[PDB]
Symmetry: C3
Subunit: 153 residues, 3 copies
């Protein structure tokens, strides 16, 4: 599976240009926390990840009664387990047509505020097939304004 990722700021672009934990073969792509943020105790926070993405896979014939955009998954990283933060929707399902910012809905199970920091890695993108992932940085996902493409401001 190949991800095309639009970074929503120069700061975010710099993070993904120097991605330090992605290796050839990996089934998950770590995503960064992109801004220091305080998560309220016993709360759900919709944490913006500063990127938009599409996933590309080979077309397949499927029962329903070359390369195509496909749905993909947002998993917690195993290392989230040492924190009090949990993914509210368990596993995120990003449909093939979504052009919005990728968000992690994080439950803070602690009675204390939780500080997340730029460069923390709490979630990862994954293919439905679990196949190795590649990615590249692009300026737009498609021609639409939500896709960050097309004419004008």
């Amino acid at each position: 599976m190949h991800l095309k990722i639009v970074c929503l700021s120069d700061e975010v672009r710099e993070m993904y240009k120097n991605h330090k934990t992605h290796h050839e073969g990996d089934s998950g792509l770590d995503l960064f926390i992109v801004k220091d943020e305080v998560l309220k105790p016993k709360s759900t926070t919709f944490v913006k990840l500063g990127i938009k993405a599409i996933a590309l896979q080979y077309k397949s014939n499927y029962y329903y009664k070359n390369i195509v955009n496909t749905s993909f998954l947002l998993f917690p990283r195993s290392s989230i387990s040492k924190t009090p933060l949990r993914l509210a929707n368990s596993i995120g399902l990003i449909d093939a047509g979504y052009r919005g910012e990728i968000i992690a809905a994080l439950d803070n199970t602690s009675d204390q505020e939780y500080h997340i920091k730029k460069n923390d890695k709490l979630v990862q993108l994954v293919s439905f097939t679990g196949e190795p992932l590649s990615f590249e940085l692009v300026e737009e996902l498609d021609e639409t304004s939500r896709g960050e493409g097309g004419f004008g401001s």
Copy 2:
């Protein structure tokens, strides 16, 4: 992936007659979830999933296993799916149930027509469905 769905009452049939990687499932009856609880919420349907046969390593159409995901909008409630993602094995013929944890210190009211969970294929392929009398 194609689902054949048995609705377990005419009220439920009505909901699915008047109903993409996930197929939203409805809460089919108003219900109060106790504070700090797990409730097995019955969804009033049985279902089998059909996909093309594949050669797999071990040791035309087949019924296959499928998944029960939370909807992303569950996040806006205090309810969480207890078993994370439900696995419905190919052999299952029972009613589909969502095990919902109410993390609130107060009771939570779910209503008929609420959509908290969805059925998903292992491949994330588009889903179709039809209503049947029998699996």
Copy 3:
């Protein structure tokens, strides 16, 4: 999907030789020793096994049998307990050689006793295809694979 499983003790080998729970999409994994989980805690519970998953090679877009990634799911029956899988679903990458661990949140205000033979989690293929398994002594020639020259 076919799993090659290394059991890390004879006690664990005894369990998997006599499985009893296993065309199924999930392979149940055992709790392998009695353990007490503290209240309001996350415990990294060691499952006493290492495992590689094998599938037929498939062509994938990226810019005969192979090692493949696989998943650690809670069992549906975990729902009746106060235990929850901290990371939702575990992702085990192709060829991973460490002991498989279940990170379990005890959401109770009471300590929770897990017991040898309890089944709380299961291994699952990304395709949901039936699973087979066999017991092996090593995954590869490396010490982390439990193989190769000893001492």
